[PDB]
């Protein structure tokens, strides 16, 4: 099993590496804002769904709405037109679904937050999710594609200071 840790700026894969990572919209990248919609993800434990399921489902093409999915999916950037060129640039190219993995995490913030993912946009913000350095997904593929057995990934989110929850993921 892999227990990733996320402290607001760094996503650590123990024994492998540290990845730049960011959570929350630009003014909401603070541990004390974690119960505000689209802010830094609430602290606690989350399961990652790393099973690779290909293209994410499109719930409404006109409104650029992607449907939820419980796995690792890709963002259909190649067909984006008009406003969806803007909106899907905030997803990136890859997303991994997160689910709260204990009751305390699930009940955080009156239970009013959800729909969490790890994704590889390069904006320096995330709409209530975790934006990670794109190389994370290449390490993930390399470390898992040769393994035959169970592949269990979680992430613990714990902010140990008031520092901004921005790890420098905006494209250089």
């Amino acid at each position: 099993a892999v227990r990733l840790t996320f402290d607001g700026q760094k996503l650590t894969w123990p024994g492998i590496g540290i990845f730049k990572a960011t959570t929350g919209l630009p003014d909401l990248q603070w541990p004390d804002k974690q119960c505000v919609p689209d802010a830094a993800i609430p602290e606690g434990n989350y399961k990652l769904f790393i099973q690779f399921q290909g293209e994410a489902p499109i719930r409404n093409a006109a409104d650029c709405d992607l449907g939820p999915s419980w796995g690792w999916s890709t963002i259909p950037r190649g067909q984006a037109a008009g406003t969806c060129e803007i909106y899907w640039a905030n997803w990136g190219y890859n997303r991994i679904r997160l689910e709260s993995a204990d009751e305390k995490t699930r009940k955080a913030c009156g239970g009013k937050r959800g729909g969490f993912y790890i994704h590889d946009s390069t904006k320096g913000y995330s709409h209530g999710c975790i934006e990670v350095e794109p190389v994370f997904f290449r390490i993930l593929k390399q470390e898992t594609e040769k393994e035959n057995g169970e592949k269990t990934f979680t992430v613990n989110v714990k902010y140990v200071s008031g520092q901004q929850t921005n790890g420098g993921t905006k494209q250089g």
Binding site: D65, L66, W91, R113, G114, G115, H127, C129
Partner: peptide, 4 residues
Amino acid sequence: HHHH
């Protein structure tokens, strides 16, 4: 939960 949407993400626009």
